Ligand binder design. Structure first.
Ligand code: LNK
Length: 12
């Protein structure tokens, strides 16, 4: 679950 980078772009 590589959501680390994903969160920076999508959520934040
Ligand atoms: C790892 C990212 C934490 C939320 C910004």
């Amino acid at each position: 679950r590589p959501l680390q980078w994903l969160a920076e772009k999508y959520f934040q």
